[PDB]
Structures are given as C-alpha cells and as structure tokens.
Structure 1
Amino acid sequence: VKELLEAGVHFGHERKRWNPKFARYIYAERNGIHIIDLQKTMEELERTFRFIEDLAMRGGTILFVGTKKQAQDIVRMEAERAGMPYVNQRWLGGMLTNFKTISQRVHRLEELEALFASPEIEERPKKEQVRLKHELERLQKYLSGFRLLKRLPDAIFVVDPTKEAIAVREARKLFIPVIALADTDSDPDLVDYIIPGNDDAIRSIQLILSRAVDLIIQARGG
C-alpha cells in the first residue's frame, strides 16, 4: 500500500532542540517550530515500506518498540495485529544483547502460568502465594509482548529513536535492521530505515503504524 498526501497530520513536531544532522529533512521554521519536508517523507516511506514487504513475505519478525507515553496504547494494538512482538511498558536493557539471560525471565512466566491453573495453588503456604502472584503481575507487564520472541528479531520498529537509543544501540551492535518513525530531534545517521515525522501526536503514530501493518498483512496474503 501507499499513502495519500495526508499533510493535515505530519509536518513537523519539535521546537528548536533539533539535531543539526536532521537538516536534510526539514522544510523551514514557522512560529519557532521545524517543519519536515513531506515531499521527502514520501521518498523515505516508499523505501521503508519496501523493506517491510521484503521482510514480511520473506516471513520475518519485527519487534515493535515504543516506550513513549503517547504511543503506549498504540504499540500494543499494532503488533498484536501481525503476530509481531512488541515492547510496551518499559524497555529492558539487553533484551537483545543479553537476550539469552532475559529469555530466562520468559520461562519464569511460562512456569508460573502453570502453577496458577494446577492443583498446587492454595495448597502450600500463602505467603509464597502472594509472593508468586506478584511475580506474574510484573511479568504480565514487561514481557507481555516480548514473549513472542523465539529468537532475536530480524528488524526493529522503533518509534521515538532518541528515547529508545538504548534499544537502537543494542540492535545497531547486533546488526539487526532499524526502522523508526523519526523527526527533528533524532540522529537519522543511525536509523537504517527512517520515516521522518511528527510523533507525540497519536494521530501520527497511529497512521504511521497502521499503514505499516496493513503492508505487513497484505504481504503475507491475508
């Protein structure tokens, strides 16, 4: 799929906190705010989306990451739609470098889910009960989407690259491709497949991700 000239939604976000390297993606300043040149965002989308089709039909896995408060309720949604994994609540340092050590945390969920169905529930100390009840509680937060990761992902779809420069760092080191919805404040020089655009705006995050996923699905043929 392709997009329209939907310009009533992305056309810049941040004030004057920008990163000089982003210049290549700005139109001009208006009322002290940078405005992204959309004619250019179209040139980038037409490539990034290419990458995803490639990935998708090749049957790949894209980890969706966005710890921003605004994208919270969106990230959850979209990933769930492919079969994609995602990082909603908070991004754990090493969910990719130290994966084998974290995937261990995953098994801890697996093993607890089990106990809370089996007969060994109320039967045994209750102090531990609470103690164990809380552990799932926390897991069913952070790991909620990571769970789907059988092995490290073929690409990451990050939202605020500068906020998730930890995730990006990691990936960058493990040679996993980076796809992010970036703008004024990011270092484009580190994002394999950029998507220059506003993002605090639900209206922006929502569009950028939906059109991506629709790409994802139509790619596999559903």
Structure 2
Amino acid sequence: YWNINLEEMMEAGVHFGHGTRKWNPRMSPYISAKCKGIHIINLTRTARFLSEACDLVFDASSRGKQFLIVGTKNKAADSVARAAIRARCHYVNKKWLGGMLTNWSTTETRLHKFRDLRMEQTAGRLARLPKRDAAVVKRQLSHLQTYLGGIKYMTGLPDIVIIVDQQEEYTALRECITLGIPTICLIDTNCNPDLADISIPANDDAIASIRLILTKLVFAICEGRSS
C-alpha cells in the first residue's frame, strides 16, 4: 500500500523549502507557496509522487534486483549508511569518483586490488613488512576504503539509484543518465524533475525528512526482499 499521512510530512521539514530568489523555474507549476525567504513545496503532488515512488521501488525489487544508494553530503553521510546496512544495499561512504558506474572496468580491477588488500589485511601478514609497505597499504587501502568500502558487495549495475539531493552528485546522476539506469531521487525547491525521470521533491534541510523518505524506502526495499 505504502502510505504516509499528510500531517507527518506537513509537521516536519518537508514544506520547509529553500531560498525564495534561487528557484529554478521548472517548479513554477509545482511549488505551492513562499514564506519568509523559504519556499513551500506542494505536498499533494509530493505524496502522490512518493506513492508512485514506492510502487516503482517495491515493484522493481519484486522482480528481484539489487538497488544502490549514493551517500556523500556529510550532512546526511552516516544516515545513508544506517539506511544501507540493514537494507542490504551497497552505498557510497563519503565521496564519489567520476566513473564508478560508466567506467566500471577500471573500477572492477580496482576492486580486484581492494579485495586482495582486504584479504591481506585480514590474514595477519600486515605486520611482516615494515612501516613503508604498511604505510602504502594503509594509504591506498584508506582511499579505496573511502570509496569502495561501502560497495564491496556489488558486481554489475543496479536498477534504481537513490541519491543525495541534487547538488554534490550531478556527476553520479549524469553517469546514471548515460547508462540509462533509472533513478528516483530527492529534489530541492530549485532543481530539475527532468534529470531523473521520477523523483521525490522535498526539502532536505531536515535530517528527519531525509530519515523519513529514506526510512520509507528502506522498508520498501526490505519488504521487497521479503518475497
């Protein structure tokens, strides 16, 4: 069914939008009101597009796939990881590389090296070599730990990618549009509904609104695994 009451969003930071002279006017038949230097998002079409969002997420996992979620902002960094360890999904820790989806051959070989270095890190032969080799392995393992630590459990492309709002990850988003991979994401008051093909326009100033829509879709995916 996947409902959310209108009052649960209407109380929290959902209509609590963004700045009133920064609006990108492809929301001009969309945005409801404006108050005190902050936009007011129309919540009817918001919840309907979230109804559609959970229909098209739960249906896509009902076919049986693996989903992906991007996490980069450092305002919603660990909340995605909480929204991805229980939900079985593979996730971006803090920061993104341009090429992790489209140039995935070299990323795949980079996972050969990252898999071998985790195999050496577990095996206890790390203390054999002195501080030089241990320093190099800790540095490259730190950088791959920054990116590839959260997506070790993926081979191939996902079906639906859900991203940190719009700003920091136009890179990952445009790799998704080049690959054709459908994405269902969050929109601010001043961004594009036509980048992805369905997305969920709600402000992400609130951590609890991010925890709201992401927690909603986490139970959508886990009930997708419920089979």
Fold-level similarity (TM above 0.5): yes
- Normalising to structure 2: TM-score of the pair? 0.91
Shift of 1:109: 1.6
C-alpha separation in 2, matches of 1:25 and 1:69? 29
Whether 1:194 and 2:199 are equivalent positions in the alignment is yes
- Tell which deviates more after alignment, 45-54 or 55-64: 55-64
SS at match of 1:34: strand
Whether 1:14 and 2:15 are equivalent positions in the alignment is no
Cα deviation 1:2-32 (Å, max 9, x = unaligned): 1111211110321021211122321011112
Map of 1:50-199 to 2, 5 A cutoff? 50-118=55-123, 120-199=125-204
C-alpha separation in 2, matches of 1:165 and 1:60? 24
C-alpha separation in 1, matches of 2:46 and 2:122? 50
Q: Name stretches of at least 5 consecutive residues in structure 2 with no aligned partner.
A: none
Q: Name stretches of at least 5 consecutive residues in structure 1 with no aligned partner.
A: none
C-alpha separation in 2, matches of 1:78 and 1:66? 10
Q: For residues 120 and 33 of structure 1, do their structure 2 counterparts lie closer, same or farther at Cα, with a shift above 3 Å needed?
A: closer
Cα deviation 1:124-155 (Å, max 9, x = unaligned): 44411221122222222211222222111111
Q: For residues 41 and 72 of structure 1, do their structure 2 counterparts lie closer, same or farther at Cα, with a shift above 3 Å needed?
A: same
SS at match of 2:29: helix
C-alpha separation in 2, matches of 1:219 and 1:154? 13
SS at match of 1:95: coil
Shift of 1:176: 0.1
- Normalising to structure 1: TM-score of the pair? 0.93
Of 54, 61, 71, 1:49 maps to: 54
Q: For residues 122 and 221 of structure 1, do their structure 2 counterparts lie closer, same or farther at Cα, with a shift above 3 Å needed?
A: closer
C-alpha separation in 2, matches of 1:72 and 1:92? 16
Q: How many residues are paired up?
A: 222
Whether 1:3 and 2:9 are equivalent positions in the alignment is no
Corresponding residue for residue 37 of structure 1 = 42
Amino acid at match of 2:195: L
SS at match of 1:157: strand
Identity of aligned residues (%): 40
